[PDB]
Amino acid sequence: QVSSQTTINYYRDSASNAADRVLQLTLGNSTITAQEAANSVVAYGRWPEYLRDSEANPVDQPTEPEVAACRFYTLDTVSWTKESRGWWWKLPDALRDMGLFGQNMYYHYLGRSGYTVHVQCNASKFHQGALGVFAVPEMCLAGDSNTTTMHTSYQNANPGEKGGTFTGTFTPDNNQTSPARRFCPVDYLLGNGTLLGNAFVFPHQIINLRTNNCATLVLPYVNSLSIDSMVKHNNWGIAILPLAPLNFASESSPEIPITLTIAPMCCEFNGLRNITLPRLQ
Amino acid sequence: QVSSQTTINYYRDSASNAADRVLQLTLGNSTITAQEAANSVVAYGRWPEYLRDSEANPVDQPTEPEVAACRFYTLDTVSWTKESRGWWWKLPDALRDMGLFGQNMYYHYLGRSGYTVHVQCNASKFHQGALGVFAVPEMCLAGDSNTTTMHTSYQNANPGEKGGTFTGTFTPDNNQTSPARRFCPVDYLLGNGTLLGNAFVFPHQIINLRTNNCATLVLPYVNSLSIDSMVKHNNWGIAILPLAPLNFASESSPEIPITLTIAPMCCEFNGLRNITLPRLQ
Amino acid sequence: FCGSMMATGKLLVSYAPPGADPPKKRKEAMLGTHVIWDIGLQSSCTMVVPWISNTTYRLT
């Protein structure tokens, strides 16, 4: 084969070769409306899809809850005080005690699912601030102990719907007798050790209180595996960090609440058995 | 209209007018086999079917669990001693703490479902007995108090998977201070007040230990309503009564166990909301 | 919403069919039918309570 600028393959094995404001969306029995939402982000431009047999690893017939699990669950609300650094919720670990989705993911061994995350935070025309919502895939976070690595515990690494928080400054877990085994992600490093500024490479939106009060993210199912355990592996992760601090009428104690509404989409399960009863506290 | 042996209708309203051994069946991830089962009874000759829109009362999109709920759940086992009169399990009240079917029926307001009941009881060629399994529709049972009627409580009328038992002789609940509000169905009267002999009008099978050791009943969804609450109304009811007492080698203490395996079929639900948490004990 | 033009917010209007504990917190209401009403510009919101009933009719 004479290629343009003589390529002959001598080895059978291949490895040996050479080198917009208005929005209303309905999922099941749940409906979401937002008159000042600045469009949606289809993360990586891929809508969630059911597993296709062409790339199907397991054989067992999949149980798709459909309406009973592809609903919008509103996680708890969090106050965005002036001196707040951020929050992070891992998925689907957040939807583990939410309706029938939690039951299905605990009962079934393997499970895949996309998500639709709607972050809601509204302020008056006289408020001043801006949030950034990033859907970090495979979101890891740094530990708190400099004497050990990858030492975080299951209970502390999976807060649930309560979520987690970013700390302004790192603080080693100096306790050498009973280490807390707890995440200590620095806000500007984003926890992973990278920089916040570059974090925009991830699928993201910005809730700028002057322009929009909502942020919609359609997160597909990204994973090295077509289907994987939901109780072990947390595919995505939502991180909400305030790019610019809240401010209002020269008032030093302004608070506004931020809410999340997550809807599993095209969620499929396999491998039914006794129900997982994990230790979380 | 001159009809054969002058019929004229004078009133607009219509009311004013004049007048075999081998069996193996798979549901979801569950499989049942029986080499000496004497065929199956499709109660009333109607296979369970999903609700058809032509006769659909509610509008809400129905959640059909399909594989996750149309499985074979094996209820507890019961010893068929010589001096045992019978047992009765109400459905779907039996499958209220069985896998995801219980969760779906508690979460959803309305729910319909057929069933496949497999009664299993095996004995040696030297055993002697015969059971009768009747799928009583709308199975009511008589109360224990002669001073009041329809006084049974929800907790006592819905034993769950434990089931109930038939008593040999009636015994009034003479306690007038705190009535037990408990069923007291006489065995030969079948509880309803009818006779046992006629009970064969209901869909039924007989487990005759000489011939067969299993009984399969495919119960459709019979109800005055297309779909109805599952936590209030118990559509069917299984009653197992020993037609001929157990006997074995002149031994006065022969026991054999009887097991039930119930599989919801074509189960559909509507009306999702907060989860019912009923008082049962 | 008969309020001022600068009053912005959101509400949850929920319909929960019968047969369970009546909703008393937003935690339980969302599980039923619900609509999120934005009070930004339009002053009105419609919740179509569907026909969920075991019987074909209901007594008055």
Partner: peptide, 27 residues
Amino acid sequence: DALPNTEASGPTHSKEIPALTAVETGA
């Protein structure tokens, strides 16, 4: 007369927002 049939529906993501209206008009 047979009242209107309750037609089927599914998930939607449009911006028509028929749910929100204005009662100020008399319609």
